[PDB]
Amino acid sequence: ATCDDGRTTANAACCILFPILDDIQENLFDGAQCGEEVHESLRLTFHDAIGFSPTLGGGGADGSIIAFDTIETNFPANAGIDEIVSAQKPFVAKHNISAGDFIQFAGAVGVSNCPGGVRIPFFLGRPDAVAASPDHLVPGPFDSVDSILARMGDAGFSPVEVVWLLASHSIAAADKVDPSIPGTPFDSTPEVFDSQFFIETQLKGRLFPGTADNKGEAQSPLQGEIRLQSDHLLARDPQTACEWQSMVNNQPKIQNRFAATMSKMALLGQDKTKLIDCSDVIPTPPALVGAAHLPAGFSLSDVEQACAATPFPAL
């Protein structure tokens, strides 16, 4: 199909996304940058989608975190999410797509601004949410590995899919974990979607970048990085450590698995065969240019190797 402005897309119903793409890139992502607003919109896709429990309810990726923001932004695991919900709500009011479609579309358009990124498959047509998420369904950084794996498993993700989705923390920072140092990233390249997150969480912890006593925070290996306790333990736990190390210096696997598992997450609560594929509307991301590496001056002796089957790669 050819849209009114001459841009093409495989399914004509997808044309309504083009003005929305332009508005988002200009006015949500500040001129298509891979910066805070993209990182916050990617976090929003997961805090929306993960509100899905077979035994309790919630409609998954349904826009409920915007539609029922008064409720869901009260949940402590949604701390800081109110800023991006407030930023996105007027786009939803202005355009003619549901909040659940908008959240997944904005997250996919944002990831496409980041070098190394992928185009996450994107489907159009989610109905408006009809219920708020239940409470207590979003994992937090102080939760055990078994707790996080049980919650994610209850929403349909295996432990390896958990590790694949946490490639998101390659373009990510924390504002509430240590409020003295907001914006401190989880890897050294928070504007590049790459394997540095899986490398750097494997280093021995050395210091706290801000204060020392924050719930959910582990020691970091670098003054300009923060480390969540959840990530510290997942990189080391026998249930997930081999998969975590398998992502290091493995950008093709990060790309393929993140796109696929993001698509699975964007469809929680939904039925792909009822929606229209509009994947080809997402921009083409830039590619990586620089090789994966340990931080300069570090060596294998600084890595806490946690996979008995396979030594950490010589980078």
Ligand code: HEM
């Ligand atoms: C698996 C368990 C997870 C835990 C415990 C966890 C925890 C956290 C925490 C504590 C923050 C910092 C919030 C702040 O203090 O500002 C964060 C940020 C973020 N998380 Fe995760 N997360 C998890 C999974 C995921 C997943 C599956 C995604 C996929 C989209 C995601 C994407 C993000 C992003 C992109 C940010 C950065 C937000 C920003 O820089 O504005 N997280 N996460």
Ligand SMILES: [Ca+2]
């Ligand atoms: Ca939801």
Ligand SMILES: [Ca+2]
């Ligand atoms: Ca990165």
